[PDB]
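Here is one record:
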Amino acid sequence: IIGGWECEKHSKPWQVAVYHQGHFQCGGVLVHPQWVLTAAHCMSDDYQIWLGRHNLSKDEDTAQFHQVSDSFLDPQFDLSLLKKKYLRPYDDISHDLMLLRLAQPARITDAVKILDLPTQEPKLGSTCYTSGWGLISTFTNRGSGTLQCVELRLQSNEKCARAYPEKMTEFVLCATHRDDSGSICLGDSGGALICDGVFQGITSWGYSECADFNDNFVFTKVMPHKKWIKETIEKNS
């Protein structure tokens, strides 16, 4: 996140850090002790999953290390996108979602907790928060340092649709920021968007340039994916 603030330590205890070979790749959400939800463009051949983190730049006692046993992509994700190192600003984020099954269940602590799925549609005008470690340095270090947060307002989708109207679907949300001061970065992918205290969106931004909240769809909407998320967990735990 660019233009945010350092979150209170352990205030986002569902926040995941996904690494590959010691290099930070993206965020994610712990949605069940055995499951992380993140973006499909964050697929890799060897996951290192970290729960309970705050400052990625140092060792932390609350940190919990996990490997992954299986990956499940939204079946409607266009698999040809996986060949690209970076998605394009016009690429559809509707189905850019993946569930990672943890080899061993997370231990629930003050620092490591699940985030419940939404039980109602989000209201326009609600206050939202998202979190992540994504840096502007997307070619060299995708995430480091302390977990950042930003406050947003949930808006009608058309407010985010002007640059790429084709990205406006039933599977996205529009959450704006006070001025042109805030952007989301690739490494923020997988971060929860929590609106009026409910998990409603998840960051899915795969391009190398960071995105202003006000001009782009960067959050995949969780509600239309509930059946698939819940059924995948039920069938594969």
